[PDB]
CSV table of C-alpha atoms and ligand atoms in Angstrom, one decimal:
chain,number,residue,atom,x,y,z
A,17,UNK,CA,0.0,0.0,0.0
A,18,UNK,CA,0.9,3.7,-0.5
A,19,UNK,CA,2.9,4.0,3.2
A,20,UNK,CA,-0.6,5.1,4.9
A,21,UNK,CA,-2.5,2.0,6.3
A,22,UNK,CA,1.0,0.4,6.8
A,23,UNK,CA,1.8,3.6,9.1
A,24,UNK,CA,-1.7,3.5,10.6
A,25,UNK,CA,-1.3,-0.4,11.6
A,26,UNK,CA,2.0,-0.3,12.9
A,27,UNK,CA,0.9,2.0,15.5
A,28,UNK,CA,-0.4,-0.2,17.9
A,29,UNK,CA,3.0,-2.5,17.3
A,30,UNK,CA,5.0,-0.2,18.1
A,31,UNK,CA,4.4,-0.2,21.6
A,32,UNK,CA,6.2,-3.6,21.4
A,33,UNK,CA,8.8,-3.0,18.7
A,34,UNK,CA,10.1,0.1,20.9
A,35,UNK,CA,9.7,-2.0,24.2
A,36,UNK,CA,6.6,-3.9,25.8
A,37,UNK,CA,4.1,-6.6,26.0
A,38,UNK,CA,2.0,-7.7,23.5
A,39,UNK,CA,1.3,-6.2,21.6
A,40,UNK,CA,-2.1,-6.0,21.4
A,41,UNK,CA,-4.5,-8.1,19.1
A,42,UNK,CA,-5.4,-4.9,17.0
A,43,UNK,CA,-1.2,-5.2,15.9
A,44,UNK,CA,-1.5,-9.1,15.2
A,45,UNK,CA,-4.7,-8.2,12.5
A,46,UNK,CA,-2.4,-5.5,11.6
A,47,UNK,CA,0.6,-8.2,11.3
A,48,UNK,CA,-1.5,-10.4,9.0
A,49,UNK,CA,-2.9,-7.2,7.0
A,50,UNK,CA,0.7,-5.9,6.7
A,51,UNK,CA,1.6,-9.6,5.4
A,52,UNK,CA,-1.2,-9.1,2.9
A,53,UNK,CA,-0.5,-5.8,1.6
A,54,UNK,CA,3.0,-6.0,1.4
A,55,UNK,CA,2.6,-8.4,-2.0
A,56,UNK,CA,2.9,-6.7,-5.0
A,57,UNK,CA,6.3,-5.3,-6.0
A,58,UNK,CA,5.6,-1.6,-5.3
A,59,UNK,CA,3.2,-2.6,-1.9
A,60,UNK,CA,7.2,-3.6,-1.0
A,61,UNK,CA,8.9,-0.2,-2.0
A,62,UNK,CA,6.2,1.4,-0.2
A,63,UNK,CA,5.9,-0.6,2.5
A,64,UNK,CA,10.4,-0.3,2.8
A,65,UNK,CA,10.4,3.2,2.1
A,66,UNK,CA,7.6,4.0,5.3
A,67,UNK,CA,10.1,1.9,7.4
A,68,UNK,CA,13.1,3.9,6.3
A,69,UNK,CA,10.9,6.7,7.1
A,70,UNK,CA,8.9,5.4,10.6
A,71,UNK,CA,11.5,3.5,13.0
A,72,UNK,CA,14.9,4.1,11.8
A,73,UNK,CA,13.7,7.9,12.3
A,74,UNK,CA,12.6,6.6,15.9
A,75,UNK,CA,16.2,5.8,16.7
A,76,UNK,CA,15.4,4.9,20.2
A,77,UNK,CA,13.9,1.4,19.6
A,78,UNK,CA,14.3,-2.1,19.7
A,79,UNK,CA,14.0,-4.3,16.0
A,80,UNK,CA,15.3,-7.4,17.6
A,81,UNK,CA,12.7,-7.8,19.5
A,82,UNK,CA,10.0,-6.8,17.3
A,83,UNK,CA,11.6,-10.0,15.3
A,84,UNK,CA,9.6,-12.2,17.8
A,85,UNK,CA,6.1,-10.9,16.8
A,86,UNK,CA,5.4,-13.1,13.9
A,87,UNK,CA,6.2,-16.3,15.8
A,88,UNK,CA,3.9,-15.4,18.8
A,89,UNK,CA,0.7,-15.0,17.5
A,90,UNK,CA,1.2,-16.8,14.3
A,91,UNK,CA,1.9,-16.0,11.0
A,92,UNK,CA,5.1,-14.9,8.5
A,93,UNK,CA,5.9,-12.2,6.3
A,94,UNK,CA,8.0,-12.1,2.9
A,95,UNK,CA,11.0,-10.3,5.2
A,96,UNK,CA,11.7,-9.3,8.7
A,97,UNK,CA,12.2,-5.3,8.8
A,98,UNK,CA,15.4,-3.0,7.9
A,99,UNK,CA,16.9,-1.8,10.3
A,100,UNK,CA,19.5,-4.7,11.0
A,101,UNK,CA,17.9,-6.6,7.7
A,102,UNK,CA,17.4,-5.3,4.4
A,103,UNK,CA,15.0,-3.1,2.5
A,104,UNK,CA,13.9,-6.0,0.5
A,105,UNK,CA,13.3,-4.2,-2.8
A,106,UNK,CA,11.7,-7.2,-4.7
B,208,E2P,C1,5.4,-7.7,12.4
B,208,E2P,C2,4.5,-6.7,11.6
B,208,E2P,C3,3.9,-5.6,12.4
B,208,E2P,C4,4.8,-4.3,12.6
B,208,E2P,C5,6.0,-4.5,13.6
B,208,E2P,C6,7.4,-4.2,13.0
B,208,E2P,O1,7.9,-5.2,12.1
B,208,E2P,C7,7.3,-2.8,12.5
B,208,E2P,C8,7.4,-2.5,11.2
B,208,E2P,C9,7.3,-1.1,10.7
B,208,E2P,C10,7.1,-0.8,9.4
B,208,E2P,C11,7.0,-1.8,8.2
B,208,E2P,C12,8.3,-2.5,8.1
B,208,E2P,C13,8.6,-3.5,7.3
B,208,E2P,C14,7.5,-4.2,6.4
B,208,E2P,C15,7.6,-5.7,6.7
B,208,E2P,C16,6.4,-6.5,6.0
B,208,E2P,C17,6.5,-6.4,4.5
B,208,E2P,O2,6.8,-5.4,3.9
B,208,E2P,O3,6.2,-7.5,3.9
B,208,E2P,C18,7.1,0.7,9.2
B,208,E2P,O4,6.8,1.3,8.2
B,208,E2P,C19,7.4,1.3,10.5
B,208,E2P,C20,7.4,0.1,11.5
């Protein structure tokens, strides 16, 4: 998607990719909507681009553990995040 419902969803994650429980339920639909929209090839410029944007502006914050999220409440996406991954320009 055009880095808006991406930024809109991540939201309530961030709470647990900067440092907390959870996260909430509202993130996991958001985890399995991300997961959906990032598909087509642009959806995964976009969706890279907002991150480049989003958390690596928001320095203070923890990727490795947002790593565990998508083995917790279950589901997979077609790459982790970039900030110690890659943008994932396919
Ligand atoms: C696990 C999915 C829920 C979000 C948690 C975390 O991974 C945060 C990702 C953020 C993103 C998206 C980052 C990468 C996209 C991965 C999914 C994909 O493109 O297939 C932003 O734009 C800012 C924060």
């Amino acid at each position: 998607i055009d880095c808006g419902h991406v930024d809109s969803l991540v939201r309530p994650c961030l709470s647990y990719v900067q440092g907390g429980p959870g996260p909430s339920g509202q993130c996991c639909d958001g985890v399995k909507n991300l997961h959906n929209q990032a598909r087509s090839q642009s959806d995964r410029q976009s969706a890279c681009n907002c991150l480049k944007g989003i958390a690596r502006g928001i320095h203070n914050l923890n990727e490795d553990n947002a790593r565990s999220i998508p083995p917790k409440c279950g589901v997979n996406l077609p790459y982790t995040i970039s900030l110690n991954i890659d943008c994932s320009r396919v």
